[model samples]
Target: PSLSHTRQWRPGVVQEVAPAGVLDLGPGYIEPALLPVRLLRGAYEQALAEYGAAALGYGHDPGAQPLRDRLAARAAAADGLPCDPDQVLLTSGTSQALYLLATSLAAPGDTVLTEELCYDLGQRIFRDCSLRLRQVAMDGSGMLPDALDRALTEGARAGAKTAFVYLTPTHHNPTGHTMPLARRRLLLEVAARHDVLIVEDDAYTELSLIPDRTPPPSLAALAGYRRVVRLCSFSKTLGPGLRLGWLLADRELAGRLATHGLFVSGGSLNHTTSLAVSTLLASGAYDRHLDAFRAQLRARRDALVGALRAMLDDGVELRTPEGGFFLWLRAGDGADERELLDGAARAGVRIAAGSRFGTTQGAGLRLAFSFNPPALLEQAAKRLTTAWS
Candidate 1:
């Protein structure tokens, strides 16, 4: 079936207003073909049959035990560390998890120290929760440890409360850079010394496109899950509509947050979906699905990176990421971002402006390969090169 007719006029189909003929490379959304509709349908059916009416009732406040236990086991296997189900709390997704932390862990006037260039939506979520956001300087690895120390010191000097430090250590958003193991340790040390908590957004944790190139151990794992709340989600790997995700923290904090009025009143968020996904996890079908999904993403990333590198001159500095959905490109000294964007628009390609992410060193563009197939991504890269060149 054609892409347009696949989900015609459903209750919540994605709607875009891009002009005709423009290949959208801006949004970091996965292509529709990658979503496991049939797999999820079977998983949900199995969940109902296996759990009976319990699947429909209000689940345990921290989430269904089966899902939490499975997640804990997966975490232990991946990180080679002990993880208890009590340390995990199911969330609506990362967005909701961020909000829950922002409201529960810190006050409105407290500050959230983050990398200079970070996830824009997450920053908005913090600001929406009435928290102040301060950027710590960063490098290719990630947030610099010294910069974080200075920021915390300055906040302390001003008599400001430090809520927590936010980081995306693996396959960081927009930049497509991973924090090395040494950097992760240094950051963790700095946070511990300052008596501050760190929120590690590990949303793209398992989406490495490079073969046999696993990223470093997570901050939580390295720190033994102390003062670090690590957020993981199926939104990128599975369909975002599932709204299924979880966070890992120390057992004490996890239990405290789970007892919040929101969870106490409504039980676990997305309880039904959690049970359905748990079925997939228990049956080992989720692992098989991920193997295929990663391969598809690898092809898309190569198509975009290869085409642009071949077509564009050295004037465009393109960073081919080892993993994740984005290819970060920096324009030459003489070219302005507005000029590149207008040219791409005229040439029928849409790209994300670097300024949208935060302060950057120079003019940069974030192109998302996850939103399009290999053919469309290659075509977009060609059009973008011609327009910029």
Candidate 2:
């Protein structure tokens, strides 16, 4: 049977709760309660005074120069990328960025490369586009360079449609594996040599969540992919409601994505993007708020890990993440991760199934710990363990 890509796009649905209290670990979104509403208010005031009601038009498909410049500066500072504002294409969100990439690049029957057991939504995207998306094996250190090499070699020899490799090097979502510096360098070397495009998704890297933990340098700067396209968003780090994301790619591809975005959705019209740009640059609350964001998630990450270890049987294998919101759990033999979700829901808990990540042999569960508090996690563990027992 063909895979279903639409399954990965989940909408927000609250089952039950204090409309605004306690931690939730089900989704990777930052707590909206912590957002800088005051900074936004300030931006609106300044914009009203300065732009004088001219800021609400259909913005340039590539986004306004001022906003793109702000984004590029931040990208350079964060990823050490020598990016020109012209190379950036602002999209509604990173999901659209991914969608545009797949739509623009992957032809029917073309092969898109990615790490096995990677992000589920992206996998679905390639499938929906009728492209044959293949998986390269991964170790804890991230995508295996040798495996990618083998895949590229086979594609070249077979004359199969070879597209780009999608990588989430910093704090990968489902697996929580960041590519190490050595691996990043090696992988980029291969991509450069093969002239393969790398799509580096840095959606969750900036908010590493753990104290003093350093992620590897982004591959975008190293490979300097005249071919590779890099994407990031404020969704996870800030809040999904911001709905603003961007792409840094070769000038040619950036132009195409921007032009194509018009046919897809016209252009982003929300002043929210401008407000976000202003806040990040002028609010003075950006770094401090981000640090607090990290602290909140770290506390929850530690608590969730502890709970999972205590609840699951000795057979459960898990990777301890150094940063970000997810924990990858390998359900022991005799455990059914798919069934466990219903049990979890009964206990007022919910978690993602591993099949959501990929169809590989290593299937289990993907637990997002940053969404909930210690108490809820503890309660969730009790229910899950009891179900298994």
Candidate 3:
């Protein structure tokens, strides 16, 4: 939810959809057809039948045991890291985790460093908490370690208490670049030296579409689970409606986060749903669904990327992302982003304007393949080529 989809709004939907003949390349979301209605139905039924009253009760604050343990096990299984159940703190989603850390970990007037372009809502969240956000320079790979070092040193010299370095290291949101292992290590070393926490927004961690394009070790894993707090969400992969995610941290930090009034007052951020989702994870249904889901994502991604590559002018450039739902396009010199977006809209296609992602503006366009079907994507691409032509 980096950007709001309020234009031509639909009823009851928190986001939006294409207005009749319009193809919306705006929001990055799972199509309604892709949502696993039948699978989740069975999961909820199984959870209630097995857990009985326990499933209905206020859950343990850190999370329901089954869900936490499963997620913790999944982390260790996915990466060769030692993670205990106590290391996972259940969250409503990444937004809540960001807010929690922003409020609990840092106070007003503190500084938070971010990539030159990042998830816009994340920057907004820091500002909402009265924390200053300084954008560090980044190449296609990701945030540069030297730039981070300079930013941290300068902030310290200015007598500013830096809260954390906010990063979307794996399949980054706006740019869709994954940091290499060496870069991740270097960044970790810099952050460790500054003794600043690294909040790794890994909402797209599970969405690496292509078989050969695997992302490197997570910042948390490379740091041996220290100096980094990695956020994982079921929203991007499963469905946003579930509103379920977890943050992995060292045991002490995890425990400390759960002790806040928010969790103590409400128990688990989500209880019954967590149990329901845990059943899906335990039964292997989640993994089965993911295989099909990822396949669909790969198809849609190629549909847009391929169409654009073959049809668009050479002045328009983009990279096929390793994962995630976006196609980041940059229009070469003398091109106007407003005209690019306006022209696309006039041609019955809607795409997100890239300037919203950062203060450092460019002649950029961010197209989402996650909202439309492959056929529609191709049709939309044709419209874009014709309109721009």
Candidate 4:
């Protein structure tokens, strides 16, 4: 019942754990302190009590009704999305959803458009499916719509069939930037014109640390929920250990993907966990948790950002992201990434190297603030300032 024994073994077992005594700002992992162990236990108990045998049974292939309806209503309220329960398909997580779409909708050698600097694993998902990638250029505001249009237009000439445009759009990984509303609309229009599917990775949208400033309407909502498939997961907000997420697609597409060999054979991707989390949503426990979670994340972000800004000199470029887990640090041009990383390690701080994500103009390091408490992040920030100073 306590977060004691389970915590010690998980970190190097199923997940990556930084070496002891080192503050690892590497993975987008929710700190063990933040994972709501008690709450989820109660939710699971509630599911068993309410559904009895049905809780353990293979649920409807798309997902159980309660979760689909609740998720649909939330989308409607937040983004004016004309969503219905039929439009939802539960997944193991966004990672699984990426694989589902990649293998289901695309053929080998098909092209997938991506942002120049994006979530590294998402690109791997494309490549593993034997799909090629054409990364569009980005500027201060995220992906350039013109660049996307150009890429889509150019693909036609070479018979480079496009499968979809994969975009994070909000609270992007590594670079904590959100695409503007206008840019979202323009990309949606371009995708529609090109008849290319748009996979909007809306993973971190709900994690907006800023209370008053919400990100723009999702690409799916802005495009009337057509020609776009929005992937979201509990992995980011609640816990990845649950291994549950869902996609919002056109009603037809949702049904089509649900009929895939994966789902047809296994029913729901995570049936029991889906029912348990649906209980959280039904009782408003998830919203309460989100409110508290965002505030804690806000504190963590500010602690590291504030400390770095207060201590570090002008050689490195850093921005206080409006929301999300990472604090992207771009160092001076031609700086040796090896020394920067090795130096951070020597100082007992671990960080993600820039090149790991993709090519960029200057050297960078992704420091994940979500993995540590505020004080520790401040300490890590202080240590880094001294190490790099």
Candidate 5:
């Protein structure tokens, strides 16, 4: 299969996209700055020392015991839900946990409802499973309860098992929308009534720039056991290379995930798991690093928005996102977003095309400020202003 039809890449085309060749205002991947790298080195040392060279062996696919305990405790404290250490299943990353759950929980032909705009990787993963994905509408506050209710009502009768409602509650991907508390409560209630589980991907929750520290509690926190399956990763928090994450849910479902793990690549990387958790908790380093990173991202986000407002003469309407790395720009009145992406690319900046989100029509664009420094962001904004309007 070609990369066009399927993602199966050819040999020569597998080259990594170079930074110079990319303005990279697309994905929410922050350039690794400081503090995180130091902690990872420290973690690697600790992991190797503790295991005494046995770190190379096959460890628990569910993850090392202490790390899982730490992750569960972190979840419990952060989300206000009491998660038993045993209930958490550590995987290669949050993505794998998602793939495992989508495959193990529901078979082929199941209807998986997600946000109209969400993590693109989830779309790929679910599509690979032969699952019929139905993307529902969403605003800043995430999946509307009314939309979800309507999806269940309509999608169910057509022999669709409503497997899951995947959400990114905090700083949702691409659009960077955070679900408000009231909406969260309403959505949880609807899920409870409809008897469907939510895979709440809290990838960017802690990265909020809110000075008041007002990040919403996890959906799992509000809606409790069995109903919601939570997946998180050090990839976004720490670094993408760590490939360590945890999945929290009811023990029964976790057992199923564990079995799936056995069949699908069995054990996970023990050393990476141990190192990531240890690095995060060892000193006050991770927290300190997160604060600085969030502040920087906050400044970049504001700068990008401010620049766009000052420039772009066209009727480019957009909602100012409070936190996270991306901006969702809606080009008003018969404007084509795909054409704008092409124009920007030729002018020496790359952005994701909006059509990747869903089949429904919207004249909007999603751009991330994660990789760009303040100066670069200003430059990119100026370029967009010239090329677009």
Candidate 6:
């Protein structure tokens, strides 16, 4: 088992170990071979030494100041916008942040507008908070501006109170699509015009695989951090076990959220881990690791994409993503999702069904190239093509 053969393993705890002889291309997990164990080990040691007993104590309501300052500076430098340390609040991850917004920012039964398809877990989180989700239509460019306008306008006219408009403009999950700058501006305009807030799930913004291209300015940045809460995580580039992420919002709202009972009682979630990661960010080690990690991801993505294109028939439409872990495949009229999944299973491959994300134009698969090596990805792709063909 993958979790075994390590001192970190704790018996009886649930784990997501892939079954033997199965090539799982389903979960958005980084390959174990790529996780920077040594880098983090050194980071933890440095953080404890620098912070002393403070590292283990209850953190500030918002988070440790060092990490918050580092993240805020990074955001400002990247987007060329003003980002204050006080405007950042750390959370366990994106999921927890969504729940916080759903519960703290809005009342139950409020409408949560979103793209036609998005991060599935996000949708679930909203629903779990007793918020209603309304999907606005989208296209290859991403959520259509007119559709968003209509949805917000109609919802308002119908007396539906909108909580926020959720989006994943940069390196979006499932589809691996980056909304264009024009589309982003247009959507922001619509949201602002309708007086609706936008929650930008930017989990994969820093993991671009393409070296020549850079993603457009984030919606939060373009909006000057008004009416937008941008969420970012180290899960994709680093490791999920750390469970560290933060949201960037206006200072007023950020301060308000930090005053919530959860933060008041717990001080901060994963304080020590945040300090450890702060050390990485302060030392510039995170960027160095990211460069190497992106290179490996690029190779894995290319291997899988190349094999699938070469082996699969023309019926399948494969859009090679510029960045991100997923390769979205749209099946032709003759193909069925169930049949494709069944075939892949028989071939000892596991893949994510498109329906898991949302309704699709046709049969589709969200294959993640992040959880396997380049050689394994190539093999999985070949096996999938053979089975599907």
Q: Which parts of model 4 are misplaced by more than 4 Å?
A: 1-7, 10-12, 311-315
Deviation (Å) of 110 in candidate 1: 1.2
Q: For model 4, how does the per-residue alpha-carbon lDDT over 1-389 read when each residue is reduced to its tens digit?
A: 56523446454575766677888788998888788888898989999999999988888888998999999998887786578888888889999999988988899999999888899989898999999998899876777888999998899998889999998988889889888888888888888888899999988988999887788889998987788999999998889889999999889889888888877788899999999999999989999999999999999998889988954455678877889899888886677888889889877998898887777777888899998899999888888878876
lDDT of each: 0.88, 0.72, 0.86, 0.87, 0.74, 0.87
List TM-scores for all candidates, in order. 0.96, 0.85, 0.94, 0.96, 0.88, 0.95
- Compose the digit string of candidate 3's lDDT tens values, residues 44-83: 8999999999989899999988888989898887676778
Question: 239-356 in candidate 6: lDDT tens per residue?
Answer: 8888899999999989988888899999987799999999999989999998899999999999998888864566678878889899899896777889989999988999999988
For every model in order, what is the number of clashing pairs? 0, 6, 0, 0, 0, 0
User: lDDT value for candidate 1?
Assistant: 0.88
Q: Candidate 2 — which residues are off by over 4 angstroms?
A: 1-25, 35-42, 259-272, 311-315, 333-335, 338-348, 360-363
The TM-score of candidate 1 is 0.96
Off by over 4 Å in 3: 1-9, 311-315, 359-361
Residues forming the 10-long window of minimal summed lDDT in candidate 5: 1-10
Model 2 C-alpha lDDT per residue in residues 17-68, reported as the tens digit of each score: 3323322445564444444556555666776666565566666668767778
**Highest lDDT: which candidate?**
1
Q: Which tens-of-lDDT digit does each residue in 114-201 have in candidate 5?
A: 9888888888999899888888877667787899999988976766788888888887777777788899999888888989888888
Point out the higher-scoring one by TM-score: 1 or 6.
Answer: 1
lDDT of 6 at 101: 87
Better of 2 and 4 by TM-score: 4
Q: Identify the runs in model 6 with alpha carbons over 4 angstroms from their true place.
A: 1-14, 311-313
Worst 10 residues of 3 by lDDT: 1-10
Which pairs of residues clash in candidate 5, taking residues 3 or more apart in a chain or in different chains? none
**lDDT, model 4:** 0.87
Between candidates 4 and 5, which one is better according to TM-score? Answer: 4
